């Protein structure tokens, strides 16, 4: 029997409560694993049973709930379940340029854009998903889509205006 454990932070506990149903129903029904929430250590516990085939889904199942730990929505984690080549790439905003204080918050605002729209646009361009943590940035998609969204984000935090990045990312999407 193979076992997976994934830690949950404190701020991810309440969303884990309100989205638990749509977390275990994709696992036990059409994927067939054993789920529980280890409440003492605050871990997510994955085990095999006698009803397991296609063992790789096991690993996929782990990444499933790991996406929900990182801040992603439930349906995007289902997209990790359904598809076979869908990856996570993560980097800090300061890992590409040293920004301190208000400049770092302004870089966050340039990634997000007013109303979120800029960030929103990049998903409709790149068929990825993006989580903006406190300093971290997480990208969910295929490898070329990850590369394209990562380049768009890095240019957004170089100092390039979000309008220019909007136009050029609409242009580069057509290849």
């Amino acid at each position: 029997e193979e076992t997976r454990k994934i830690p949950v932070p404190a701020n991810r506990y309440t969303p884990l409560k309100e989205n638990w149903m749509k977390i275990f129903t994709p696992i036990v029904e059409h994927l067939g694993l054993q789920i529980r929430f280890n409440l003492k250590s605050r871990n997510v516990e994955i085990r095999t049973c006698k009803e397991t085939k296609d063992v790789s889904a096991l690993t996929k199942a782990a990444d499933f709930v790991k996406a929900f730990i990182l801040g992603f929505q439930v349906e995007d984690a289902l997209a990790l379940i359904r598809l076979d080549d869908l990856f996570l790439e993560s980097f800090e905003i300061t890992d590409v340029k040293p920004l301190k204080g208000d400049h770092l918050s302004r870089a966050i605002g340039r990634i997000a854009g007013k109303g979120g729209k800029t960030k929103f646009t990049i998903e409709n361009v790149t068929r990825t998903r993006i989580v903006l943590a406190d300093v971290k940035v997480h990208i969910l998609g295929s490898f070329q889509n990850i590369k394209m969204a990562r380049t768009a984000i890095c240019n957004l935090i170089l100092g390039n205006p979000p309008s220019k990045v909007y136009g050029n990312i609409r242009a580069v999407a057509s290849r």
Binding site: E75, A79, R82, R127, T128, L140
Partner: peptide
């Protein structure tokens, strides 16, 4: 949903188009 977006971007739309072209006594 990301899976739905990728599947719809990789498939072809079909269906809706209504083309209007063209005894007892």
């Amino acid at each position: 949903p990301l899976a739905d977006q990728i599947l719809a971007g990789n498939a072809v739309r079909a269906g809706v188009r209504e083309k209007r072209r063209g005894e007892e006594y």
